[PDB]
Symmetry: C2
Subunit: 159 residues, 2 copies
């Protein structure tokens, strides 16, 4: 019925869209990136459709950066077998992500392909550190899954 | 004045206290682990004292597991140079952590040594998956830093 499940997780902040290392705190006037995962339950009755991430600023003054360019302002990677297999994260084709909304205070991304049971998506989002704490709410949903699934991640910004 | 800063991040869920791989969703009747980082600002005016993590269940029915045994129910690791140097995470001595509280609905850990500017602590916490979504609030504080710093992590539990 429900018979499909999804999960969301925060991975915290990084100083690069992909690779690099962790950050937080962040000095005002520097870029940083939030990373979030959406994970399809390995037991799901088939692939999931319209897998959507909605991120919104709830506290503080940092802003999502740029105009919404894939490979600079955001990245979406697929781990095709999730934690259950040795395949790694690789960026999807530009064709496979729709920017529903890109603004300094809110970003919405939808994955157009269907998401295999067990597979995971990694979303990286560029932000402008502006002083104090920034917190964002991340919501994950799909058509088939009883969403939303919600986390809050928080970044300390040095004035 | 303030002149010291701290940060907190969620790292999401894992199927092992250390190492292993990521999980979430989690099937009811299985163990899983939350990981959280507390990070000292590299610019802090000296080391920080009484670095404390307070984690509380806000939604759902999963519980922190066991009686509070270091190396089974929780782990605390130090990365002595944080992301700024090549030293890795290593578990601290049992003497260096006080269990302020350990209950199925709330856990409190304090790091007794002082935390060098730039250094980070990684806290892993065992939980019992019980069906629906579980969310925990994690608060980080120190004596010198304008805390608390708060995140929320959420786990989907399969009935
Ligand atoms: Ca999660
Ligand atoms: Ca994989
Ligand atoms: Ca953070
Ligand atoms: Ca290090």
């Amino acid at each position: 019925p429900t018979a499909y499940a999804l999960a969301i997780s925060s991975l915290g902040e990084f100083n690069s869209l992909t690779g690099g290392t962790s950050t937080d705190p962040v000095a005002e006037g520097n870029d940083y990136y939030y990373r979030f995962e959406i994970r399809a339950w390995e037991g799901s009755s088939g692939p999931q459709t319209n897998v959507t991430l909605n991120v919104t600023r709830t506290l503080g003054n940092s802003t999502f950066a740029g105009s919404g360019t894939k490979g600079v302002d955001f990245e979406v990677e697929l781990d095709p077998d999730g934690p259950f297999g040795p395949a790694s994260y690789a960026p999807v084709l530009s064709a496979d992500v729709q920017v529903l909304a890109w603004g300094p205070t809110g970003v919405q991304l939808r994955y157009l392909p269907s998401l295999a049971p067990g597979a995971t998506l990694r979303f990286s989002l560029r932000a402008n550190a502006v002083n104090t704490n920034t917190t964002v709410q991340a919501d994950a949903t799909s058509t088939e899954a009883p969403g939303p699934y919600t986390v809050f991640e928080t970044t300390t910004i040095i004035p």
